[PDB]
Design a binder for this molecule. Sequence first.
Ligand SMILES: CCCCCCSC[C@H](NC(=O)CC[C@H](N)C(=O)O)C(=O)NCC(=O)O
Ligand SMILES: CCCCCCSC[C@H](NC(=O)CC[C@H](N)C(=O)O)C(=O)NCC(=O)O
Lengths: 209, 209
Amino acid sequence: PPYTVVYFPVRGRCAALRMLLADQGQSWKEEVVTVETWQEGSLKASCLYGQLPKFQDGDLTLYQSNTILRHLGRTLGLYGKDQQEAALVDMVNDGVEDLRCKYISLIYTNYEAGKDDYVKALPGQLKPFETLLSQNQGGKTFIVGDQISFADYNLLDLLLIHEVLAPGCLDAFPLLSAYVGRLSARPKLKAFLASPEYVNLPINGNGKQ
Amino acid sequence: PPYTVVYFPVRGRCAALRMLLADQGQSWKEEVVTVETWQEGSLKASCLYGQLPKFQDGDLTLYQSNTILRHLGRTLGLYGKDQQEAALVDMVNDGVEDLRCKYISLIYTNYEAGKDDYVKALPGQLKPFETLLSQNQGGKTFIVGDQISFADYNLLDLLLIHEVLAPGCLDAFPLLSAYVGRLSARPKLKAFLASPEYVNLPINGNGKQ
Ligand SMILES: CCCCCCSC[C@H](NC(=O)CC[C@H](N)C(=O)O)C(=O)NCC(=O)O
Ligand SMILES: CCCCCCSC[C@H](NC(=O)CC[C@H](N)C(=O)O)C(=O)NCC(=O)O
């Protein structure tokens, strides 16, 4: 601590981490990089991998958003309670990553044309999480075990951006809905999701949503 | 333990955990799934994300390559020695994933037309790892401190498939070429990189490399 997030002013790949932090009583600083600024060359060359986010936890400066989330699960204890659960929250976040990366392909490289087949192909892609909840206590808790993890935060968001893509896709998936409902009902998250801070910050930055 | 790897007759995405368990003196049963068995549908409906590798470590069946790699790191002590070392081995294995994702899209989507353009972007893609290496003992040891990590194996698999695709790439990356020269040497691994079950396997299946 203190936490400092540097990203472009989109919800993007840091919505999961922002939701984590605010739910887990933590504060953070936002340092915004606009596209004009990014274009002025320096910071992209400072960034290890040319991209964003950049997290600063104290003296540690992290990159790759999944790394950032794993790191806050080790540190804050959002990573299972044993090594089986740990393996499974890995299994599940890499599930959300694979889909998230496909979403990104639509939103930036084929939205208008591809959006079509995307919401058709979606049920088979959201299928595994529906399975996962039924095995984990019949979905009345969390995707891995019975304590929130950093994987509950990255799945809940992937779910939320898709309910915006398709107002209603989660209805085919009744346990997936029960989950989002329950998790947006956790107070610190609820207060966050309803904030100016969250609401007027675009999901993808290019207009598509 | 014991370890069972369930995959197609190709190195591909099990190459790195096979290098890991071989270098660390472990042994595993390879369960070989032919395209004929994948085609006859029963295995797919068992795998949680419809795909393979599938890995059994005793009572755990785990899906997804980097989750297995991350598991063996947690279990066989190969995820660095302290909190900073772990977020950095994850930050490196992530950086690696991003470039493996682009290599499999080159290989199973459009090799022929996409290659020249791929090999054009490669120096800019390998350059982060040279850097990481220079930051630590001038790249005299490993990619994250004193001792080997899962992220060291997986990165080594990427540069070996990349030297088959673009022979001459690593020659400008001397630390990175020496890194391969020194981790290939460690004779438990070196015995494996000349075994039948490694030399007699296709990199990619599709016939491209
Ligand atoms: C203005 C709106 C842009 C919307 C996308 C913002 S994120 C774009 C990109 N970053 C990434 O790709 C982040 C991915 C990285 N692997 C991670 O997991 O953290 C990135 O920083 N790209 C900039 C670049 O490569 O030049
Ligand atoms: C049958 C074609 C010849 C074999 C080529 C190698 S197949 C490897 C491929 N696996 C993946 O894409 C799994 C990816 C998963 N994210 C992981 O962490 O590893 C995969 O399983 N896909 C095959 C499929 O979906 O049928």
